[PDB]
Each structure stands twice: as C-alpha cells, then as structure tokens.
Design a protein around this ligand. Structure first.
Ligand SMILES: O=P(O)(O)CN1[C@H](CO)[C@@H](O)[C@H](O[C@H]2O[C@H](CO)[C@@H](O)[C@H](O)[C@H]2O)[C@H]1CO
Ligand SMILES: O=P(O)(O)CN1[C@H](CO)[C@@H](O)[C@H](O[C@H]2O[C@H](CO)[C@@H](O)[C@H](O)[C@H]2O)[C@H]1CO
Lengths: 648, 648
C-alpha cells in the first residue's frame, strides 16, 4: 500500500499533534477544512470534505475550492452539529467534465475534431447521469447527452446545450468524480456552546456579608447573584470554597503573618475541618451551597469552581498521604513557589510517588462537585502539575461527562499553554491583559483566531485578582471602558473580576500588578447600591455589551475576524461576521485624549463592493451612520470609548 | 495511555508527511534533530537524540541544547552512518543536578539552610553515581559526595568540591536524568554518498560519430569519456538509447515532419526493432553498451539512463497492450502534450487500465538495465504519471537494490515537486536555471538548504537540452562561468549538458529558452580538440571547480550554507562549512561590467570572533588575501568571475 493515493490529498488541516489529539469545535461553530490537492498531468481536479458524526452519518455535500491560484491548496467551510466525537476526511478526484468543457470551449469554434469532442462529452454526461439518484435530474443530463448526440444541429448549438444553467446546477450537486481518493480520517471534538461562548464574573462570596455577619455565606452571597445576572453574565467563577489553613496564614496585603481576625487566602486549602470536598464553615453548609447553585441556575448562571491542586499545612492529606509531597532530608516540606511569586502558606503536590492515587482522588473530588451541580472548573496553575496528569483526569471526567468544562489558568510560555489546550482543556487564559497597543492586539488576536483556534478557546478576563495592569492603573475609568469593549468583542468568552465595574485601580505599589488591599487576604465589602446610585460604575456598559453579544451571532464566535487599517496608531478597527450578521468595532485605545482618525474599510471582507456605501448603527448609542471605503471617526474618551456597530 | 509523556517531548523534526515517509540523509551527512521540550514546574530539563541503526544499535550519547532562550525548542546535530533504514527518538528528562546547582549557588554564600542544601546535593550525586558504569568516574563522584558530606569543611568549600571541571566532565557524559520520557521513533533513510554528492555530464552518444560514420555508436562515443572524466565528472547521463519511432518523427529544430536521414527525438521510444529494453541499431549492440559502461566504470564514471515512460506510435506496446493508452472514440490515440509544449511524435501512457502490468513491466525494464550495470536512472516527466506509480516502482526496486538512484525531472509546481521527492526520488531537478538575481538565489537556496533538505536532494544542471536561459544568452562566456561557479558551489550535486563548456548560447528564436539547431533532432558533431586548442571553452574551469569540490568537504554537503551581506545587489557572498573545512564564495552576477563591492562577513557564522582577521586563498587563481569583518573585492568579467576561497 502506498502513502499517496491515486489522486494526492495531503496535509489535511486542522490537525493537532499529527492526529493523536482531536481538533476542536463547538455546536454550531463553523471553521475551514483544507488540504493540498493535485494530480498528475494537466487535467482538472475537484475535492470535497466529508464530515461524519459520532454515529457515523456523513454530512451534506461540501465541495472545496482552490484558495489561491497555483498553490494547490484547497479549502471549504464546515459546520459542527451535535456534541460528540466526529471525524472528517477530504476526498479528491479527477474532474473530467471541467476538463472537457475547457477543451470544448476552444475546439468547437475552431472546427477542431468537433464530432469527436462532442461525442466524448456525451459519453461523460452519460457516466455522470449513471450516478444521479433523482430521476428528473438524471433525465435532464440524458437530454443533454441526446442534444450533444445530434449531428443535425450546429456545433455551437450542440455545445451550448451542454452549457445551460440547469445542467450546471445538476453537475454542481452531483459531479462526475474520477478516481476518488480519500484522506485518512481526523478526529474532531465537538463540545457545547458554553465552551466557546459565555460571559464570566468572578467574585468572593465571603466579601458579601452583612453588618451583623461581615463574613458572607452562600445564603448571603446569593443575594448578589441577581445583580450579576442582570449584568448579562452566564457563568460565575468562585475562588476556592473550602476551609482555609491557619498555619503560616497570610495577613492583609500578602503579609507573612496573620493577626487577629485575618481571613487568609482561599487558595490555602484544607484544615482538620475537611479538604477539597468540604466547605469553609463560615460559608455555611453543603445545603447552603446547593441553595446557591440553584438560585444561580434559576437566574441563568452556571457555577465554575476553582480547582487548586495544592494544600495548606493543615490539610488532612499532609498526614494521611505524606507521599503526595516532596520532603527535604529533615522531613520538612518547602512551601510552593512559581518564581518570583512565593506561596508561603501552601505546600505543592508531588506527583511521582502515587500518581494513581492522586488522579483517583482528584476525579473523586471533581465528581463530588459535579454531583452538586458544578459542570465547570477553573483550574489553578495547571502548568505546575504534570501535563499528562491533566490529560488523564480530563479524559476520565469527559469520558463520563462530556459537558464538563475545564479552564486552564496557565500564564506561562506559549509551548506549555498550547500543549495544555491540546490535551483537553476546553478553555485557556491568555496574554490578553498584556496586549494593549494596536500592534499587540492585532498580532495576538491574529494568532488566537488563526491556527490556534483549532485547539484553544480563549477566555478574556480583562482583570483578575492577581492582575491589575498598568493600562488600567494609569487610565482610570475610560480605560476600563476600552478594555471592556475590547474583551467583550474580541473573544466569544470574556470575564471580569468583581470591582472592575467600580474601576478599582489602586495598585499595591508602583510597578506592581497587584491590587492595594487585595481581596485575597481580606474581606472586601462593597456598597453596590450606592455605587449604582452615584453612577460610579460601568455596569450599564457591561450589560449593554453582553446584550449586544446576545443579539449578534458574530460576537459569539472566534475564527471570523478581520482588522481594518486606520491612520492613527491609537485607533483600532475590526469586524466579525457570522452569516448575515456583521459587527464593526472601532476603539480608541487612548484613554486620555480625544482621537480623530480616518478608517479605510476592506469592503470585500464585509461582503461589499469598494464603491458601495452602507448604513450602520452604533449599538452603544443608537446613532446611525453611512459608511464607505473611507470613514471619519469621532471618538472622545469619557463620552464614548468606541463604536460597537451592526451593519444594517 | 496519554499522548503526552511524563516529560513532554513534542513536534520532533525533521519529519516527513507526519511520519508516514522517512526523512533522508546520506552516509557521513550531518543534520539537526530538534524537538519541543519542557516540563511542569520550574526545574531544569535535559534532552538527547538516540539514533538506532538498521540493526537497532544506538549511536553515541547525543545531548541537545535549547536553541534560543524562552522558546523551548531544543536541537542537536547527528551524523548518519552505514546505508539503510535508521530510526531516531528524542529523549527528554528532568535535570535535577542543574536545578540544584542553580539554587545552591545562590543559597550557600547567603547562608540559607546550607547543611540541608549540601545534603540534597550529596544524595543527588549518589544517585548520579549509581548509574555511571566507569569505575574511576564512579570514584570521582563518590569523592564529591564525601566532600559534600563533610561538616568539618567550609560550606563554600564543600560546594566548590561539587563544581570542579573533572566532575563537570563526568556529569557531562553521564548525567542524572529524571523521569526519562521518549518520543515515538521516526524513520531515517540513509543512502549512498552519490545520492547527495556528484558531478553530472549529459551528452548524446549519437553525436560522437566519425567522418566515415556520422551517427555515433557506443564504441565511438566511448572515446569521448576520457575527456569527461578528466573534467572531473562522476556521472554521465545518456538520453534514451532505444530504437526511435518513424511515424510522425520530428525534423530538425522541432519541425513536424522529418525528411531524409533526419534522426528524430530519442524520446520517441520504440519501433519493431524493440522497445525500452532494446538498443537503437545505429548505436550498436548490447555488447557494445556493456563495453561503454565498462570503460566508463574504468574511468570512474557511472551511467545514468533516461527512463521516459512513453511511446512512439511504432512502439510494440501500441498493438501488444492497447489498454496502456487512452483511446478516443474512433480508436485513435491523441499525441502527448505538456501545455504549452506539444509532443506530436509520441503517445502518453494511460495508467488506470492494468496498473499492475505497467508497474511490473517498468520494474522489469529497470532491472534489465541494472543487470547491465546501470545504478542510476534519470526519470522523464514523472509528474505526468501518477505519483503512487513512482512510489510503487521505486519502493519495489530499492527494496531489492537500495543502491539505485532515481532523479526526478519534474519542472512543475512546488507541491508536486516536493511530493515526488518525499515518496522516494533520491534527487530532484530544481528551479535553479530560473534563479539568477541575488534575491532569487538567496531565497531559493535558503529554501532548499532549509527544511526541504529533509526530503529533497537538488541536482543543479546549469543547462539542459530543453533549457537555455536568457541569462546565458545575453551574458556569453562570463555568464557560463558565473553559473558554473554558482551551480558547482551551491549544491553538492550539479551538472551540465554537452556544449555548455563551449558556451553554446544561440536560441531558437527571441524569447525562447530552446536551442537553435537543437541536438534533440539532429546529430551535433563538435570539434572538441579544436575547441580545446583554440581556448574557446571553460572546460578547465569546470575541471578546477570539480577538483575544488573533491578537495573541500564543505562543498560535498548541502545543509550548511550561510549568506553574507554585501553592499552591491550584483555581488553575492556565502560560506559553507564541514568540520574544520570552510569555503567562502563571492560571485559577480553581472557578466557584463566590472563590479567592486564591500563584503561584510558574519564572523560567528564562520566560527571566528568579530575582531579576528583570517588568511584565505582563492582556489580559482591561487591568490591569497587577508579578510575580516569588512572586505573590498573587485570582480572583472572574463578574468575573475568569482572568488572561490578556502579558509587558511
Ligand atoms: O500564579 P497565579 O496562578 O497567577 C496565583 N495563584 C492564584 C491564581 O488563581 C492566586 O489566586 C494565588 O495567589 C494567592 O494565593 C497564594 C496561596 O493561597 C498566596 O501565597 C499569594 O500571596 C496570593 O497571590 C495562586 C494560587 O495558586
Ligand atoms: O517537459 P520536458 O520534460 O522538459 C521535455 N521532455 C524531455 C525532457 O526530459 C525533452 O527532452 C523532450 O522533448 C523532446 O521530445 C519530444 C518528444 O520526444 C518532442 O516533441 C520535443 O520537440 C522535444 O523537445 C520531452 C520528452 O518527455
């Protein structure tokens, strides 16, 4: 058997790790399948993509086209249906009809071998008709044959009969394919919509307490949920909800020694009160948690729990499973680190003594939370645990529960980030917060929406409790508005950490990306009602952005994205399209000065002619404009950061 | 089982078609194996390449290095040994000793639990010691352990004892490797030297006849061979040596109708006198051919026969095997074409009728000529025959006779050229003749010496009987000299077609790359003794260049090639290196005007420091210069077309 088939079809894409891992999609998501296709000699080829579902059923007729002259690179758009494991192949074939048409269009007006040429055509159309299932279509082709086979008609008329629109249409749906040759199947993993699309909100339940009881419970915190749903979020991410260690507990502002009533870091998981399968007592009971999850569900909110595979010195595992830790010669355990960050309040897990036990317990914990309605897990620092560990665990869980979504919080080097996405993580944190210039945003989103989209789904958190970027520190509220517009419109999944709405932007110190008085080490009660009343929140803008996303399919996908040139470095423009839905966004990245620029739109990417002029509506303001190949903007920081426009 | 191992090792290169075909090398050839390597956490990693020969024997320990900071791409040079099918794997591992040294070098002068750190090191070196086979190396490590375990000595001294060069050297040879994780093996095909390296000469035996017998025989043509060997060529390529058809035979200058004693195209193979396994009667007998091959061998010349899978209308197959041709409805067979070229004197083969018969007869023919000492075949237009046909034939032949070399004459699109190389062709023709500017040469050779070298070996014919480039037409002898230097020094394999050294450069008509009075359609007697006597030939230069190649290993490999900047578009500079041998070449691409320029050498690429000044000798003249980071050169057409310099 040969590696190359009768008609060469090579380098089918997307492909992940030479086919040992699946490419990714979600229900209803479109993407391009491509291949290198050609044959020997000078005759024509055709090609088509055959997509098969988990039950083995082939998809619709899906012909490919050469993507650029002389490249032999062919492609077509496909769309994923029901969730599950699909497969796809590319079929390549000789296209004798196209070749015959090519020669005939030349030879008939030249009187060259006309009887012979027309007869060759008749014999081809006969073969074509042989494989057409519908009887009227078949008869249409046989009628073409018969007209071709008629020496009483002029050569030009005989040829013309072979060139009618109805014939073109039949051959379009059921072409005569010579020597059909197939690629080897590639795996495609189709997961649910929320894996790609959703708006996330992070907050600390313990901060949402009462005057009488400052430490919030699930019962008290659930009162915040309606406000979160009203802002249009779909997923709530909670920091670890388990008991917190006392030994080496951190004090306020990440100080080494807790004093008095310091509450410590949620990531310092575990005490005699229980471990990762337990709830912090100040939060309430398992029944209270169930209540919280239910109220969230009623409001259209899914819960994402933090999973941080590490533990405090007081965690039961420390004495129950000593071999789950690396011990120095005196038996002591060094606290965990991810330099230059130090985590004096926790021990790291060692994975090479009892990998089976660690995996088994991990999936036991996960399956526990899944039993209590948690179908999403935000995984802390997975890059400091073995890659194959996550591969195994995720495979186990999704093996039984494919709806479960895992989000990789890996701010690290590109190789590790990519590998983690490839082995099963449904979503990944990204370099987004560190991409603020037009060049940074454009290059990075070009990357994310490009080849990487075949294995990675980005979750754009505009901030996190560990990351307050300088852009926001120096820029204030207009910057929050800009970053919100950007995050919300560039990724089908985005998120913020509570306080972002209030434009909280005071750093621990100059040069730091930490918050002053960080919520990680102390309760941080917020007067939401007052902020709302005094209008010092961008919650309305957040709500509008999520509504716009909910009303415009173009913003609920990733791969279709195009940047348009402007004449100002501070002003960026880009468009996203999904079916007949087109959204155009123009953002002023300068949070301090009014910026005017001319935007020169790439009209064919919008599906328009260069001379054409089209009506747009700015969904942030309701204003309408008429935009063409050259458009003036128009952006004043504070009054408006950006246009988020739909094409009318 | 997981796709990723304990220590990730990913995207191992070189790789051909995702592992379904082998990467290529020849005996003695070095190339880089690379991989993406990293681990969880922050500890150091190490990596090494394992080459296993056809009997499964591993090569030496071959450690990798990170090729660039922060990229996680690691690489090492390996060298191929005996011919056959090899395999290679990359091993990745934790490097705990490197990690420990890093931490210890900081912590010990600082006084941070130094007893503990030194004990960790001692226990580590004990582990490292356990694996070392050598007794003395073992004693050296255990001595380091004991010095580490000596609280009577200063901490800095205990640590210093662990850092001596002797110890570095031991761990450098037998490092302590944690959690060794291997890639899946990739195949490497090692073929004989001549597959990569050799000088080729094409000529028509029929032109070397006598006053009394104008049509040459193998016995008369054999008298031309000494001069060819004297020019330093290793391989002689003969156009088809079979009987030539009479039906529709072409006349002189590619005219439609032969008249009189017109000799026709050698590529119009076959008559009732015999087919592809027979010899043209005017050339003599099989015995005469055996004599020719023997005399060539005596002179150190190998024969490459043209294999052109096509037929004159008089070929026996036409009536013996009608199904090997595509017939039109009137039973006639359309003549072959390669648009816009027309081959009115031949029929093309049809392959999907009796594929086995065609393959069987092809390999039968090849084995016939192999039995008469032909171990190289130059294959005509393989891209107009099915790719899998060649894959099959070459696999079949090399399965029994791995020394046989196939050269693909496929001037076509890049995808086909690459695929043909990848499926088994030992050598490929290239776009060389159409790369004449500095930009063209640099970019194309960058391509060929880069990733493509994993599957393709270039044969630089500076001309062929079908290609007389405009550069040569307008430039005359100095241009022939330039292209000779370029071809001979840029590829380890190059060639010319007879008459090149005479600077034959008259085209068929303006705008053509065909020769006037082409040898393809007529006897072309040349008075070689006279040409030599009158000095109107660059045969001595050819001889000199081949001598330089034979004397300088740098020119007998492909992959090591670097271009150095000059301040003139018309002046190109590049270096090639193999071990301690370095060749530096500077070429004036202007064949009409003296050019002077400054050549600024990239000294690290030469293995020299930026301040160094090095003696070089131009092997074309014997002249010596002293060159450094910036050098004046003056190159004069007709006198000094180029410098071909050796270092020291
Ligand atoms: O490196 P990163 O992943 O960005 C930080 N990780 C989490 C991100 O999800 C942070 O919440 C957390 O860092 C906090 O918690 C640590 C231990 O609980 C503290 O030592 C540190 O003082 C604080 O910052 C730590 C968890 O693993
Ligand atoms: O397309 P290319 O491969 O470069 C042309 N093929 C050979 C090269 O290997 C050429 O020598 C050869 O073209 C010659 O032979 C033809 C038929 O024998 C003639 O029609 C043409 O008049 C002549 O030129 C033809 C063979 O296959």
């Amino acid at each position: 058997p040969t590696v190359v088939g009768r008609i060469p079809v090579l380098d089918v894409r997307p492909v992940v790790q030479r086919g040992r891992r699946p490419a990714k999609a979600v229900t209803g998501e479109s993407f391009e399948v491509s291949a290198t296709v050609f044959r020997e000699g000078h005759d024509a080829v055709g090609a088509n993509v055959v997509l098969r579902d988990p039950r083995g059923r082939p998809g619709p007729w899906t012909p490919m086209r050469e993507l650029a002259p002389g490249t032999d690179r062919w492609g077509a758009t496909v769309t994923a249906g029901e969730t599950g494991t699909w497969s796809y192949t590319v079929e390549a074939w000789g296209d004798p009809v196209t070749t015959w048409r090519h020669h005939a269009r030349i030879k008939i007006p030249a009187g060259l071998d006309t009887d012979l040429v027309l007869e060759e055509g008749a014999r081809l159309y006969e073969r074509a008709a042989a494989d057409v299932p519908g009887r009227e279509d078949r008869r249409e082709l046989l009628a073409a044959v018969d007209a071709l086979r008629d020496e009483s008609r002029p050569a030009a008329s005989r040829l013309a009969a072979a060139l009618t629109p109805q014939v073109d249409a039949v051959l379009a749906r059921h072409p005569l394919r010579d020597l059909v040759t197939s690629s080897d199947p590639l795996p495609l993993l189709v997961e649910r919509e929320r894996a790609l699309y959703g708006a996330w909100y992070e907050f600390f339940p313990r901060s949402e307490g009462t005057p009488h009881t400052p430490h919030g419970t699930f019962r008290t915190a659930a009162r915040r949920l309606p406000a979160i749903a009203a802002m249009g979020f779909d997923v709530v991410y909670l920091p670890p909800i388990h008991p917190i260690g006392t030994t080496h507990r951190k004090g306020r502002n990440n100080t080494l020694s807790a004093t008095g009533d310091d509450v410590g870091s949620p990531w310092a998981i575990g005490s005699p009160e229980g471990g990762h399968d337990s709830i912090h007592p100040a939060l309430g009971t398992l029944d209270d948690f169930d209540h919280f999850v239910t109220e969230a569900g009623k409001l259209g909110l899914e819960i994402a729990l933090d999973f941080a595979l590490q533990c405090s010195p007081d965690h039961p595992w420390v004495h129950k499973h000593p071999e789950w830790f690396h011990h120095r010669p005196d038996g002591t355990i060094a606290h965990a680190e991810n330099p230059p960050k130090k985590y004096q309040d926790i021990y790291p897990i060692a994975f090479d003594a009892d990998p089976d036990g660690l995996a088994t317990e991990t999936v036991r914990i996960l399956r526990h939370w899944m039993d209590h309605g948690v179908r999403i897990f935000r995984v802390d620092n997975p890059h400091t645990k073995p890659v194959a560990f996550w591969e195994r665990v995720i495979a186990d869980i999704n093996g039984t529960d494919p709806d479960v979504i895992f989000l990789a919080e890996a701010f690290t080097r590109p190789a590790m980030m990519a590998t983690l996405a490839q082995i099963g993580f449904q979503q990944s944190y990204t370099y987004f917060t560190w991409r603020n210039t037009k060049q940074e945003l454009t290059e990075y989103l070009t990357e994310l929406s490009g080849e990487a989209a075949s294995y990675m789904r980005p979750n754009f958190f505009a901030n996190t409790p560990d990351i307050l970027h300088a852009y926001l520190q120096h820029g204030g509220r207009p910057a929050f508005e800009v970053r919100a517009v950007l995050a919300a419109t560039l990724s089908p999944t985005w998120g913020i950490y509570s306080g972002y709405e209030l434009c909280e932007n005071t750093p621990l110190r100059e040069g730091s990306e930490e918050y002053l008085d960080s919520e990680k080490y102390q309760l941080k009660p917020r007067d939401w009602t007052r902020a709302a009343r005094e209008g010092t929140t961008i919650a309305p803008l957040v709500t509008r952005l999520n509504t716009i996303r909910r009303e415009n399919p173009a913003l609920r996908q990733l791969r279709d994205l195009h940047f348009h040139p402007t004449d100002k470095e501070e002003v960026i423009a880009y468009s996203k399209r999904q079916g007949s839905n087109t959204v155009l966004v123009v953002v002023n990245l300068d949070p301090r000065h009014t910026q005017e620029a001319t935007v020169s739109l790439d009209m064919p990417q919008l599906g328009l002619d260069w001379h054409e002029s089209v009506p747009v509506r700015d969904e942030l303001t309701g204003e309408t404009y008429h935009w063409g190949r050259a458009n003036y903007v128009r952006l004043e920081p504070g009054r408006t950061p950006a246009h988020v426009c739909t094409v009318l």
